[PDB]
Design an enzyme around this catalytic site. Structure first.
Site, PDB file in Angstrom:
ATOM      1  N   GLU A 188      -4.120   4.452 -10.854  1.00  0.00           N
ATOM      2  CA  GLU A 188      -4.603   3.129 -11.149  1.00  0.00           C
ATOM      3  C   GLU A 188      -5.829   3.222 -12.023  1.00  0.00           C
ATOM      4  OE1 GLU A 188      -5.354   1.438  -7.155  1.00  0.00           O
ATOM      5  OE2 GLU A 188      -4.768   4.191  -6.371  1.00  0.00           O
TER       6      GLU A 188
ATOM      7  N   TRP B  35      -9.116   6.343  -1.247  1.00  0.00           N
ATOM      8  CA  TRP B  35      -8.870   7.159  -2.345  1.00  0.00           C
ATOM      9  C   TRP B  35      -8.318   6.569  -3.133  1.00  0.00           C
ATOM     10  CZ3 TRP B  35      -8.106  10.129   2.329  1.00  0.00           C
ATOM     11  CH2 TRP B  35      -6.478  10.531   2.632  1.00  0.00           C
TER      12      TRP B  35
ATOM     13  N   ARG C 177       0.124   4.640   2.912  1.00  0.00           N
ATOM     14  CA  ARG C 177      -0.201   4.846   4.424  1.00  0.00           C
ATOM     15  C   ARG C 177       1.174   5.452   5.306  1.00  0.00           C
ATOM     16  NH1 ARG C 177       3.958  -0.425   4.827  1.00  0.00           N
ATOM     17  NH2 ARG C 177       4.473  -0.412   3.024  1.00  0.00           N
TER      18      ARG C 177
ATOM     19  N   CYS D 120       0.892  -1.497  -0.138  1.00  0.00           N
ATOM     20  CA  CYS D 120       0.218   0.195   0.183  1.00  0.00           C
ATOM     21  C   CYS D 120       0.609   0.912  -0.313  1.00  0.00           C
ATOM     22  CB  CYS D 120      -0.619   0.123   0.779  1.00  0.00           C
ATOM     23  SG  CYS D 120      -2.155   1.471   1.340  1.00  0.00           S
TER      24      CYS D 120
HETATM   25  C1  HEM Z   1      -6.345   6.833   1.742  1.00  0.00           C
HETATM   26  C2  HEM Z   1      -5.782   6.352   0.457  1.00  0.00           C
HETATM   27  C3  HEM Z   1      -5.552   4.968  -0.400  1.00  0.00           C
HETATM   28  C4  HEM Z   1      -4.520   5.261  -1.227  1.00  0.00           C
HETATM   29  C5  HEM Z   1      -3.842   6.423  -2.494  1.00  0.00           C
HETATM   30  C6  HEM Z   1      -4.154   3.703  -1.361  1.00  0.00           C
HETATM   31  C7  HEM Z   1      -3.569   3.587  -2.317  1.00  0.00           C
HETATM   32  C8  HEM Z   1      -3.245   2.228  -2.785  1.00  0.00           C
HETATM   33  C9  HEM Z   1      -2.355   1.629  -4.007  1.00  0.00           C
HETATM   34  C10 HEM Z   1      -1.876   2.251  -5.515  1.00  0.00           C
HETATM   35  C11 HEM Z   1      -2.161  -0.482  -4.249  1.00  0.00           C
HETATM   36  C12 HEM Z   1      -2.019  -0.667  -4.799  1.00  0.00           C
HETATM   37  C13 HEM Z   1      -2.892  -1.569  -5.712  1.00  0.00           C
HETATM   38  C14 HEM Z   1      -2.979  -1.743  -6.433  1.00  0.00           C
HETATM   39  O1  HEM Z   1      -1.428  -2.241  -7.426  1.00  0.00           O
HETATM   40  O2  HEM Z   1      -3.890  -1.796  -7.662  1.00  0.00           O
HETATM   41  C15 HEM Z   1      -3.350  -0.307  -2.411  1.00  0.00           C
HETATM   42  C16 HEM Z   1      -2.984  -1.658  -2.052  1.00  0.00           C
HETATM   43  C17 HEM Z   1      -3.534  -1.352  -1.008  1.00  0.00           C
HETATM   44  N1  HEM Z   1      -4.307  -1.146  -0.046  1.00  0.00           N
HETATM   45 FE1  HEM Z   1      -3.291   1.284   0.362  1.00  0.00          FE
HETATM   46  N2  HEM Z   1      -4.677   3.185  -0.424  1.00  0.00           N
HETATM   47  C18 HEM Z   1      -5.518   3.440   0.645  1.00  0.00           C
HETATM   48  C19 HEM Z   1      -6.347   3.153   1.359  1.00  0.00           C
HETATM   49  C20 HEM Z   1      -6.216   2.489   2.654  1.00  0.00           C
HETATM   50  C21 HEM Z   1      -6.561   1.768   3.391  1.00  0.00           C
HETATM   51  C22 HEM Z   1      -8.216   2.621   3.994  1.00  0.00           C
HETATM   52  C23 HEM Z   1      -6.591   0.254   3.344  1.00  0.00           C
HETATM   53  C24 HEM Z   1      -7.488  -0.417   4.853  1.00  0.00           C
HETATM   54  C25 HEM Z   1      -7.602  -0.138   6.007  1.00  0.00           C
HETATM   55  C26 HEM Z   1      -5.449  -0.257   2.409  1.00  0.00           C
HETATM   56  C27 HEM Z   1      -5.133  -1.310   2.243  1.00  0.00           C
HETATM   57  C28 HEM Z   1      -4.222  -1.836   1.087  1.00  0.00           C
HETATM   58  C29 HEM Z   1      -4.692  -3.021   1.492  1.00  0.00           C
HETATM   59  C30 HEM Z   1      -4.304  -4.688   2.429  1.00  0.00           C
HETATM   60  C31 HEM Z   1      -3.106  -3.513  -0.140  1.00  0.00           C
HETATM   61  C32 HEM Z   1      -2.944  -4.781  -0.708  1.00  0.00           C
HETATM   62  C33 HEM Z   1      -3.947  -4.698  -1.926  1.00  0.00           C
HETATM   63  C34 HEM Z   1      -3.728  -6.130  -2.647  1.00  0.00           C
HETATM   64  O3  HEM Z   1      -2.439  -6.972  -1.855  1.00  0.00           O
HETATM   65  O4  HEM Z   1      -3.993  -6.575  -3.609  1.00  0.00           O
HETATM   66  N3  HEM Z   1      -5.389   1.082   1.786  1.00  0.00           N
HETATM   67  N4  HEM Z   1      -2.974   0.385  -2.357  1.00  0.00           N
HETATM   68  C1  LIG Z   2      -8.140   0.629  -0.531  1.00  0.00           C
HETATM   69  C2  LIG Z   2      -7.613   1.231  -2.077  1.00  0.00           C
HETATM   70  C3  LIG Z   2      -7.139   2.268  -2.908  1.00  0.00           C
HETATM   71  C4  LIG Z   2      -6.780   2.335  -3.152  1.00  0.00           C
HETATM   72  N1  LIG Z   2      -6.550   3.449  -3.989  1.00  0.00           N
HETATM   73  N2  LIG Z   2      -6.300   1.327  -3.790  1.00  0.00           N
HETATM   74  C5  LIG Z   2      -6.999   0.145  -4.353  1.00  0.00           C
HETATM   75  C6  LIG Z   2      -6.153  -1.150  -4.554  1.00  0.00           C
HETATM   76  C7  LIG Z   2      -7.284  -1.718  -5.048  1.00  0.00           C
HETATM   77  C8  LIG Z   2      -6.584  -3.408  -6.168  1.00  0.00           C
HETATM   78  C9  LIG Z   2      -6.527  -3.389  -7.045  1.00  0.00           C
HETATM   79  N3  LIG Z   2      -5.820  -4.430  -7.314  1.00  0.00           N
HETATM   80  C10 LIG Z   2      -5.325  -5.606  -7.213  1.00  0.00           C
HETATM   81  C11 LIG Z   2      -6.385  -5.583  -5.915  1.00  0.00           C
HETATM   82  N4  LIG Z   2      -6.838  -6.802  -5.183  1.00  0.00           N
HETATM   83  C12 LIG Z   2      -7.958  -7.024  -4.123  1.00  0.00           C
HETATM   84  C13 LIG Z   2      -7.977  -7.610  -3.015  1.00  0.00           C
HETATM   85  N5  LIG Z   2      -8.293  -9.133  -4.574  1.00  0.00           N
HETATM   86  C14 LIG Z   2      -7.785 -10.248  -3.795  1.00  0.00           C
HETATM   87  C15 LIG Z   2      -6.983  -9.061  -5.509  1.00  0.00           C
HETATM   88  C16 LIG Z   2      -6.895  -7.830  -6.080  1.00  0.00           C
HETATM   89  C17 LIG Z   2      -7.039  -3.972  -5.295  1.00  0.00           C
HETATM   90  C18 LIG Z   2      -7.047  -0.100  -2.070  1.00  0.00           C
END
Ligand code: HEM
Ligand SMILES: Cc1cc(N)nc(CCc2cncc(N3CCN(C)CC3)c2)c1
Ligand code: HEM
Ligand SMILES: Cc1cc(N)nc(CCc2cncc(N3CCN(C)CC3)c2)c1
Ligand SMILES: C[C@H](O)[C@H](O)[C@H]1CNc2nc(N)[nH]c(=O)c2N1
Ligand SMILES: C[C@H](O)[C@H](O)[C@H]1CNc2nc(N)[nH]c(=O)c2N1
Ligand SMILES: [Zn+2]
Lengths: 405, 404
Positions: free
Chosen positions: B285, B280, B111, B108
């Site tokens: 993305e 958000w 964070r 993430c």
């Molecule tokens: C507040 C603004 C936030 C932004 C800008 C953000 C941004 C991102 C981005 C860019 C990714 C990569 C996902 C991808 O490449 O498709 C990600 C993954 C992730 N985020 Fe954040 N996030 C936010 C909030 C949160 C919150 C509130 C949580 C949980 C309480 C969270 C938990 C996670 C987790 C667990 C992943 C890994 C997802 C996966 O493994 O598929 N995020 N986030």
């Molecule tokens: C809280 C949050 C904010 C944000 N801007 N993006 C995300 C990531 C969304 C996201 C993108 N690609 C993949 C996943 N995962 C979701 C969980 N799924 C099991 C695999 C793919 C999730 C999460």
């Protein structure tokens, strides 16, 4: 099912298993507890022999004679040689196979589709720094080929028990000087400040341009390194211009044609070649994005964005992305204009995908370092981004080695 | 021992000591690194030890380690596990746990925000219908008319010999993907399978490129139920470009709220199989991955033709040019609609600040370099040049099998 890493391509949905990693005899830096894959940089006669045997086995496999009389005789020959001298020597064709396999095995190199096409110059007879210079000049001439670039490696004599190494002190055969200024800033390439200051200590009269070509510090065994200025006509450079932004040419930027890594160790069958410079041709992002736009390099992003009249006071204008694209375009256009081999990051990554398919069939896998393979701009627009990769160390290999000083 | 972590742009070096607090194995071994893989390949003292560890984290967080409240809580957990094979969290412990899990999420980039998370306790949920009410309130809260607020809603934990509470959708808002028998796909190809499950369970399909899917909600050991989200709850942003007037005519749009709904939240050994969370978007993305990936909406070539670019050859960098414009259109449209979004430069700059905060607070930060570095303009951001250490800390978000 299979007891091997399962590897997925997320674009195509296709699955392979990497069985080749079973062949790895050397541990990398990762553990079950933590991955260290992003880190840039993390003999006993018995040890030599097992390494030598392994290599000789690889060699005879590659010529389809495993178990043959000649294979067993070569094994016996190497053991005897090590038994009496502590080391052994490679036959010429063994050196050629090994240099190629070292390239083939390089996990960070995106240009491996070309691995079979490598001109190997045997320079194991070299006995002086002057002579290293002659071989290096020949290498540059052959490899540059007036812009129609050809992959090449020149191999100098191997590390010897109780004898100094052959070493090329420069990290590349072509490097721009980096001059530290009175204000603390750097004129030229900040990547090369240390080598520049070493060249000066060793008697080089420094220039004061942004693009001064460095001399070579060449070190023959148990001797101080000697300094050699490359004759300017041997160093092909390309002035950078942009196809539509007429002012770009007025920036006075340029880059050299030949990427020739010169500080890496070539290890084959336990033998270590401390000087074995190799060269290919550039992928455009190495020049346009990394060398010209890294903040700790020439750092020209802002200058170009101002010329393009972008909003440099806010990230969300994407001025950095816009300038970087036009700089990359300029590199590609200028190399194509000057008829000098270069490959863009799209063509390069597509060809690496083909390489992966080739290797999957030839060897059951291909060691690849995702972070280095994925280009530094436009990452997910290239197919390698969506390709899971397994990273591991095979030998023969190119390895880092500590600096001679 | 402890990894020496270097920033190549600044020359600065740290040492990660936090990684030693990892109790869970990742996929790498000394023989081979598997860091680029997306998913993983595959008694009661165990639970008790994870429970005590978490309770220790919690009481340390409120500076009350060793206190009688601390000691009494460890006895409660132990008594409850010994008698029942499990235990329950207090709300305040759950709030802490959910924040720590976000904090510990190595993929993430957002964070910096970890301490600001609204936690909805939905553990008193006994039906799909109730889950839907909680989900609607989550979406309403999190969306906040475009002033987005990070939130998580936590549904009842898994229990031995009972099906899980599950949200079948991977996100609360997803566009349908309709597989046309002409081989291709209309809508979002990533959502073909879920779109088909929705139809089978009785949803009347649309035929558009941006049809918002219904939620499939599953209360334990029951078939999932279908719930259409009230259109006024699902904020969406029409995409236009500040200078290319033809762009709007592409009819592109995306939803405001990225809310992941199929991940497992693990706290103190307890598992929460439904715990959707939302923040958000970072602009890449939408602009880069969702709109430009070849196996998604794949609009690169369309935009390039409309920009009159040389499509014939890769060397013209048409893809790079069109991608930049699409990302710009996303930022511009979200800004115009007053919907919270962050660009990849601002996001990665804030993430570097986060790495520095965490270094001082905890002596490290688990980060997955491949996911932190944005999909365009990688080396143009500070994170590219930053070495990172990846490892699993608990509380954690985890992947879990699809419930079908
Ligand atoms: C507040 C603004 C936030 C932004 C800008 C953000 C941004 C991102 C981005 C860019 C990714 C990569 C996902 C991808 O490449 O498709 C990600 C993954 C992730 N985020 Fe954040 N996030 C936010 C909030 C949160 C919150 C509130 C949580 C949980 C309480 C969270 C938990 C996670 C987790 C667990 C992943 C890994 C997802 C996966 O493994 O598929 N995020 N986030
Ligand atoms: C809280 C949050 C904010 C944000 N801007 N993006 C995300 C990531 C969304 C996201 C993108 N690609 C993949 C996943 N995962 C979701 C969980 N799924 C099991 C695999 C793919 C999730 C999460
Ligand atoms: C023929 C065209 C070639 C291309 C386009 C190419 C491309 C690249 C690129 C882009 C990198 C990443 C370097 C960086 O970003 O820092 C790389 C690394 C590397 N290449 Fe290739 N290469 C080519 C030829 C060769 C040859 C001929 C050899 C050796 C025989 C070679 C061996 C290596 C090695 C050992 C590395 C890793 C060095 C490091 O850790 O920085 N390459 N190559
Ligand atoms: C033959 C060749 C062709 C090419 N296009 N690029 C390269 C890589 C150039 C390069 C860039 N950055 C770093 C390194 N290495 C060189 C070895 N050095 C010890 C560490 C840095 C090498 C080599
Ligand atoms: C920290 C990170 O590993 C470092 O900046 C890497 C990332 N990927 C790279 N990829 C290539 N091709 N070349 C590089 O120098 C780097 N640098
Ligand atoms: C194979 C590769 O790991 C895969 O495409 C990853 C790369 N990095 C990523 N990074 C982010 N932020 N999101 C992703 O989905 C991915 N996908
Ligand atoms: Zn790893």
């Amino acid at each position: 099912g299979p007891k091997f890493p399962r590897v997925k391509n997320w674009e195509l949905g296709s699955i392979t298993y990497d069985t080749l990693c079973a062949q790895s005899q050397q541990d990398g830096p990762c553990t079950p507890r933590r991955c260290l894959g992003s880190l840039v940089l993390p003999p006993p006669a018995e040890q030599l022999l097992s390494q030598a045997r392994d290599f000789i086995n690889q060699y005879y496999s590659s010529i389809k004679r495993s178990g043959s009389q000649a294979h067993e005789e070569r094994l016996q020959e190497v053991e005897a040689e090590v038994a009496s001298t502590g080391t052994y020597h490679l036959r010429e064709s063994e050196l050629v196979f090994g240099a190629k396999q070292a390239w083939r095995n390089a996990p960070r190199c995106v240009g491996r589709i070309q691995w079979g096409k490598l001109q190997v110059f045997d320079a194991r007879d070299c006995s002086s720094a002057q002579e290293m210079f002659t071989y290096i000049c020949n290498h540059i001439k052959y490899a540059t080929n007036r812009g129609n670039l050809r992959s090449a490696i020149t191999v100098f004599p191997q590390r010897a028990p109780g004898r100094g190494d052959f070493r090329i002190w420069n990290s590349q055969l072509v490097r721009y000087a980096g001059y530290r200024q009175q204000d603390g800033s750097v004129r030229g390439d900040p990547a090369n400040v240390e080598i520049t200051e070493l060249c000066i200590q060793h008697g080089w009269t420094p220039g004061n341009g942004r693009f001064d070509v460095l001399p070579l510090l060449l070190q023959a065994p148990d001797e101080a390194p000697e300094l050699f200025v490359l004759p300017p006509e041997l160093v092909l450079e390309v002035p950078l211009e942009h196809p539509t932004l007429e002012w770009f040419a007025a920036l006075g930027l340029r880059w050299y044609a030949l990427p020739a890594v010169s500080n890496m160790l070539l290890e084959i069958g336990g033998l270590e070649f401390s000087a074995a410079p190799f060269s290919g041709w550039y992928m455009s992002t190495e020049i346009g994005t990394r060398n010209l736009c890294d903040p700790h390099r020439y750092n020209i992003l802002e200058d170009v964005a101002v010329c393009m009249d972008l909003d440099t006071r806010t990230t969300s204008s994407l001025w950095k992305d816009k300038a970087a694209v036009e700089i990359n375009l300029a590199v590609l256009h200028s190399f194509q204009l000057a008829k000098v081999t270069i490959v863009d990051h799209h063509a390069a990554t597509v060809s690496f995908m083909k390489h992966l398919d080739n290797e999957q069939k030839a060897r059951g896998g291909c060691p690849a370092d995702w972070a280095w393979i994925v280009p530094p701009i436009s990452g997910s627009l290239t197919p390698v981004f969506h390709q899971e990769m397994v990273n591991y160390i095979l030998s023969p290999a190119f390895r880092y080695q500590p600096d001679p000083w």
